[PDB]
């Protein structure tokens, strides 16, 4: 099914991968796509995880409206907003905006529900769709005009507590990516120019696509401080009587996560799905031809299914009579099912099953008896091993450097760069403009993050010459 090579035309391979796997169907409204069951079930897995996890922090789900009136919304973002002007042929008395994000919808309610210290912390989240008329090239999952996300918005008595929630959420994004999707990410802070301008400090969790050198933002979690509180009058009264503004966080993650998974683990044969989010972990394929024991094969397959299910192993028997076994191999292969269990006559009175692991192609003869624990063994190996190879690929792709003249060759090898920087407002804008100048002539490099994990700083700013403050990862991005 898949004929483009990941390492040759990466955009075509991507498109082939997501289409031939049946994850995505193309659509006539530019920048929008149909998520098919095979993609959708993966979303449900990660949604269920994060949701359970934030529930344990006392976050509660809600649903606020998708419309916001012009007046409330309009108290680089403006061009993106979709506006409803009519119902039927009738013009609205005033046009209304489809929500691009929900601060202006939720925060007036907050000012109202928060009167007393008794009322904090207020922690809410919502799963919804968001619409932005994106100017950049859209890409299925990574950047779409309608996407699905969660946005979580909290308010607290103290900077201390809100900040602690910020890091807690960021940890859960690392887990969404690293634990669920086996995609390695790097926690850090955003530069003053990349952060959410309505907040005090933006934390982020950053990913990398080796095949085009692009960094990509996996998720984000903001300490908002008191700015939105003053703007929206979210004041509260302490236990000593005084009238203080609240300290807020907000944080979101999207269907982009799926796109990043697909890009990280995919190969020339198509998708490869980490076991932890695969709706089919093991596919069973009865081998049938010239009528050899047709009934005996099928009967065992059902025994094995109930078997493996005793272990919470998600199993599907590909039982369908209208497709050949070779067809079934290719299908589940392109779909990225982690384990294929093949079973014909030879393996019937042999008491075994052949099992092929999607990541490497390695095959195992395994006795009916040893399967459940040996598949559990393998599924952990697949999952651990996808993450590990990816962390290695990520680290091969970051060059540590000290001087500006190292930049372009790193960027030409499609690598990020870790460099000491004075964290000056202008330097970043200058660096973008110049890296564009050089790329045009041969592409803008930006700040991706200031990582939490700072190496030792014995040192001059790699661009300005000034005294450098911290190590900052840069690159081309999405």
Ligand X SMILES: O=c1c2ccccc2ncn1C[C@H](O)C[C@H]1NCCC[C@H]1O
Ligand Y SMILES: Nc1ncnc2c1ncn2[C@@H]1O[C@H](COP(=O)(O)OP(=O)(O)NP(=O)(O)O)[C@@H](O)[C@H]1O
List residues near ligand X by CB under 6 A.
Answer: 77, 80-81, 100-101, 132, 151, 196, 220, 222, 250-252
- Residue 84 binding: pick among a second copy, ligand X, ligand Y, none (C-beta 5-8 Å cut-off by kind): a second copy
Query: For residues 48-107, which are near a second copy according to CB under 8 A?
Result: 60-69, 72, 78-90, 95-96, 98
Give Cβ neighbours of residue 82 (< 8 Å, ≥ 6 apart). 97, 98, 100, 131, 132, 133
User: Distances in Å between the alpha carbon of 446 and those of 318, 417, 423?
Assistant: 48, 10, 12
For 387, list phi and psi in degrees, rounded to 5. Answer: -65, -45
C-alpha to C-alpha distance for 478 and 438, rounded to whole angstroms: 19
194 or 318, CB closer to a second copy? 318
Sign of CA dihedral 160, 165, 170, 175: positive
- Nearest alpha-carbon partner for 67 in 112, 97, 104: 97
Choose, by CB under 8 A, the member of 2, 18, 73, 148 that binds a second copy.
Answer: 148
147 or 163, CB closer to a second copy? 147
- Residue 254 binding: pick among ligand X, ligand Y, a second copy, none (C-beta 5-8 Å cut-off by kind): ligand Y
- Residue 320 binding: pick among ligand Y, a second copy, ligand X, none (C-beta 5-8 Å cut-off by kind): a second copy
For 60, list phi and psi in degrees, rounded to 5. Answer: -115, 145
Instruction: Find out whether the peptide bond into 39 is cis, omega within 30 degrees of 0.
Output: no
CB of 36 to ligand Y, least distance (A): 17
Number of residues written out for the chain:
478
118 or 136, CB closer to ligand Y? 136
176 or 462, CB closer to ligand Y? 176
154 binds ligand Y (CB under 6 A): no
Breaks, C-N > 2.5 A, in the chain lie after: 75, 442, 458
Cα-Cα-Cα-Cα torsion 466, 469, 472, 476, nearest 10 degrees, comes to -30
147 binds ligand Y (CB under 6 A): yes
Choose, by CB under 8 A, the member of 18, 54, 131, 315 that binds a second copy.
Answer: 131
143 binds ligand Y (CB under 6 A): yes
Using CB under 8 A, list all residues that contact a second copy: 25, 27-29, 32-37, 40-41, 43-44, 60-69, 72, 78-90, 95-96, 98, 109, 112-113, 116-118, 124, 128-129, 131, 133, 146, 148, 320-323
| Interacting residue ranges for ligand Y, rule: CB under 6 A | 101, 132, 134, 143-144, 147, 217, 219-220, 252, 254-256
């Amino acid at each position: 099914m898949v004929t483009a090579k990941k390492d040759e035309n990466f955009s075509e391979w991507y498109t082939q991968a997501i289409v031939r796997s049946e994850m995505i169907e193309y659509y006539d409204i530019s920048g929008c796509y149909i998520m098919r069951p095979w993609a959708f079930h993966i979303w449900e897995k990660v949604q269920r995880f994060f949701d359970d996890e934030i529930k344990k922090m006392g976050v509660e789900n809600s649903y606020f409206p998708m419309f916001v009136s012009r007046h409330k919304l309009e108290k680089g973002f403006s061009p993106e907003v979709a506006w409803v002007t009519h119902y039927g042929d009738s013009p609205l008395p005033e046009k209304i905006a489809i929500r691009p994000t929900s601060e202006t919808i939720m925060y007036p309610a907050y000012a109202k529900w928060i009167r007393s210290h008794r009322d904090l912390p207020l922690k809410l989240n919502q799963w919804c769709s968001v619409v932005r008329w994106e100017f950049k090239q859209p890409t299925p999952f990574l950047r779409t005009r309608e996407f699905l996300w969660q946005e979580g918005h909290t308010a607290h008595a103290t900077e201390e507590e809100a900040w602690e929630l910020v890091l807690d959420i960021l940890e859960l994004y690392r887990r969404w990516y690293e634990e669920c999707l086996a995609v390695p990410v790097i926690k850090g802070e955003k530069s003053e120019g990349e952060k959410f301008a309505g907040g005090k400090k933006t934390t982020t969790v950053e990913a990398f696509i080796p095949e085009n050198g692009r960094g990509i933002q996996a998720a984000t979690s903001h300490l908002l401080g008191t700015n939105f509180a003053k703007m929206f009058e979210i004041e509260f009264e302490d236990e000593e009587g005084h009238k203080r503004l609240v300290h807020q966080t907000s944080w979101g993650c999207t269907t982009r996560s799926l796109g990043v998974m697909i890009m990280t683990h995919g190969d020339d044969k198509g998708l490869v799905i980490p076991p932890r989010v695969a709706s089919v972990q093991v596919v069973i394929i009865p081998i049938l031809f010239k009528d050899e024991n047709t009934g005996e094969i099928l009967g065992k397959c059902r025994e094995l299914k109930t078997m493996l299910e005793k272990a919470d192993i998600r199993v599907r028997i590909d039982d369908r009579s209208n497709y050949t076994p070779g067809w079934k191999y290719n299908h589940w292969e392109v779909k990225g099912v982690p384990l294929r269990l093949e079973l014909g006559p030879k393996d019937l009175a042999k008491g075994t099953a052949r099992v092929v692991r999607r990541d490497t192609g390695e095959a195992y003869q395994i006795s009916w008896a040893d399967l459940a624990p040996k598949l559990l063994e393998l599924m952990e190996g697949i999952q651990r091993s996808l993450f590990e190879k990816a962390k290695a690929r990520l680290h091969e792709g970051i060059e540590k450097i000290s001087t500006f003249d190292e930049v372009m060759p790193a960027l030409n090898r499609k690598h990020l760069v870790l460099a000491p920087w004075c964290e000056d407002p202008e330097s970043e804008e200058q660096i973008k403009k110049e890296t564009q100048k050089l790329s045009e002539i041969q592409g803008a490099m930006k700040t991706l993050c200031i990582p939490f994990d700072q190496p030792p700083m014995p040192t001059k700013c790699f661009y300005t010459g000034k005294p450098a403050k911290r190590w900052t990862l840069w690159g081309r991005s999405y």
